[PDB]
Design a protein around this ligand. Structure first.
Ligand SMILES: Nc1ncnc2c1ccn2[C@@H]1O[C@@H]2COP(=O)(O)O[C@H]2[C@H]1O
Ligand SMILES: Nc1ncnc2c1ccn2[C@@H]1O[C@@H]2COP(=O)(O)O[C@H]2[C@H]1O
Ligand SMILES: Nc1ncnc2c1ccn2[C@@H]1O[C@@H]2COP(=O)(O)O[C@H]2[C@H]1O
Ligand SMILES: Nc1ncnc2c1ccn2[C@@H]1O[C@@H]2COP(=O)(O)O[C@H]2[C@H]1O
Lengths: 201, 201, 201, 201
């Protein structure tokens, strides 16, 4: 129902957005991109996700988000085949993020402070002077910078609208100091991914 | 009265919860668990507890929560027989938490960042290959990890609905750097509890 | 006017308080103490002081609070005779606090993380085995712990309702690392105050 | 429209301000200065700028503020001629601030934790015993303290109403650890500016 505080919320908040756009005299293409983002991202409803989750117990918090990430976990070998407690620990630190076609999720050469899991959408991995590798539902990227603490080893550009979950470097490390055999699984893959664009260490 | 902003609040916030459940298409058992949590936890009323407490002076803050924790303090030798200022200092750092039958309050082997005091309810302490010890009103658990900085030495599972107060590791230490003879009282007991599931140090 | 959002606010928020008191079944003396605090502290009006101040420029922020602390600054030699920029720097870090007759603003032997300036009210300084010194409008206390980093050297108990400004240890140090000749003025006095209850260093 | 939640917001919030002024019995000149600030700063509309921006993706966040800072970037050689990614990185860390004629944006001799970019307005740089240098649209100041970590090397006083963007020292460094050749461009200029008021290092 539209009388749901959560749909009425979406409408009022989108109203705020329109006036901000109007105050700053944003171009029409930029206004359309935002409108479209707002629909893909929120889908007519706004929740105070983390305050609602925050009001619950941790087991319910865990149970809920496991339920929500069922396809993501089962599509992703790293997750699907791991200890659930590690999986849960990751899952509860993730932040949902949407991107639009054309967006540079990551720029090569920059400093990186999050990695990403692809729930839905297709993305492009772009190195200066290699062909282009694609990643879709059930893969992740942006992990290399977190392991090395250097710079981004590629740009990553959205082909489609993307529904992603991001993980901060501090959470990534926190989960890996508690689950160290999982560090290796990211390393193996990260080396393989470097090898192929002809790089090392 | 239901016209009390605090009952009207409970109703509106529970409405939010229902719509969140609906958006994410949660199973019925999971919806019932949450409904039931919400009733045991809040009891038809929501307060901004720490903002109301935050608006008061510290002595009133102290007086109030002492009043509220009277049965807890008097049921618990560690508290009942201590210096009230230490007791007050602990009490003002606690966070109320509810759990449901079946919940793993603590999982063995994980990293722990809070201990717990049992105001109401009964819990089960579960070590791989020992019998099962029970704890109820007036005991605490989860202190061992805080003292050692290692991992959880047992799982702890709720038998009943549990009304608990949690204490973070940083607060635990803060209160113990100011009240060091109380460190010992946790140590003595913590050693005794290790002894019995056949462990050490 | 009572239609002022700030008086209507005081009334609604005090309503919240009454229901909290009712939920937790607070004794009548404790309910009266809180009622009375709420009137002395807020005086029928609630402002989001720091959000309103936060929306302004720093010079206006500074100008305002200087205006408000005029009697305090001019009653207090340390402030009255200092560099205004130091005074301003202190003033902008203060937090208004009210206390009631009987309250222990400070307990001897505890760890201290704020000092206090007396705008209005009279207080009692109590050392085990000395007579009792009184402080009123235009003095400060609780500075000794901040200078030494040891424990409280006295209890301090409110005789009257007290209108005070508190300063955290971190702000105290921040202002003193920038204004080091003012450190001395607190030291001189702090030594004199120790001398008299027969203590040192 | 005035029915826009953002204009209604400005009106309600300005109402709050008036009552605060009234409670604290502010002088008329001080009330007029604030009224006038509120109009130059907000212009009849209040947005939750960073919450709206916070709800969007980073690329949209970036695109928007680039659009908004177009004249600032193109008026300022340091920005205009740099790598956009550095520019974007700076731009997204800026905080809009307004000042009034007469205001001391910076006092010589104090500790500094932000620098400033002038979008609109004219300012005065004042050293004890030199003539006075003026800066307007398209310059910046307050960078010297950030580079040296010493004290302010001048007072800076607003001649006109000023629309400025501030950058905190921590953000300044963060952007410069990632873009180190830009450190030099601030150094060169900062040395030149010292030279001229007859100073060094
Ligand atoms: N060959 C590959 N296949 C898939 N992904 C690949 C490569 C090479 C790099 N990458 C990703 O690019 C990302 C850019 O940010 P990163 O933090 O370097 O992590 C990198 C990897 O996740
Ligand atoms: N024998 C015992 N009796 C009661 N409680 C016991 C034992 C042994 C461990 N424990 C608790 O299990 C908890 C698991 O988390 P912990 O942080 O290891 O603290 C432990 C104790 O509080
Ligand atoms: N002789 C004195 N006259 C006035 N105030 C005095 C003394 C001795 C201690 N004190 C205050 O007690 C305070 C207790 O907290 P403190 O942080 O030790 O600072 C002390 C002084 O401000
Ligand atoms: N000669 C100059 N021309 C323009 N600006 C000048 C000078 C000398 C100092 N300054 C500015 O004063 C500022 C005071 O704070 P600061 O942090 O020292 O940075 C200084 C410079 O930005």
């Amino acid at each position: 129902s539209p009388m749901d505080s959560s749909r009425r919320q979406y409408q009022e908040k989108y109203k705020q957005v329109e006036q901000y756009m109007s105050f700053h005299k944003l171009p029409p293409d930029t206004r359309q991109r935002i409108h479209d983002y707002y629909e893909h991202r929120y889908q007519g409803k706004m929740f105070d996700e983390e305050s609602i989750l925050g009001e619950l117990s941790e087991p319910l918090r865990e149970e809920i988000i496991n339920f929500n990430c069922r396809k993501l976990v089962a599509s992703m070998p790293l997750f699907a085949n791991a200890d659930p407690n590690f999986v849960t620990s990751m899952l509860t630190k993730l932040r949902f993020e949407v991107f639009q076609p054309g967006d540079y999720i990551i720029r090569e050469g920059t400093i990186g402070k999050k990695m990403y899991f692809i729930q839905h959408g297709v993305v492009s991995v772009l190195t200066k002077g290699n062909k282009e590798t694609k990643l879709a539902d059930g893969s992740y990227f942006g992990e290399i910078c977190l392991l090395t603490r250097g710079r981004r080893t590629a740009s990553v550009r959205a082909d489609t609208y993307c529904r992603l979950y991001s993980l901060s470097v501090d959470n990534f490390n926190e989960v890996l100091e508690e689950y160290p055999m999982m560090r290796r699984a990211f390393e193996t893959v990260a080396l393989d991914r470097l090898d192929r664009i002809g790089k090392k260490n």
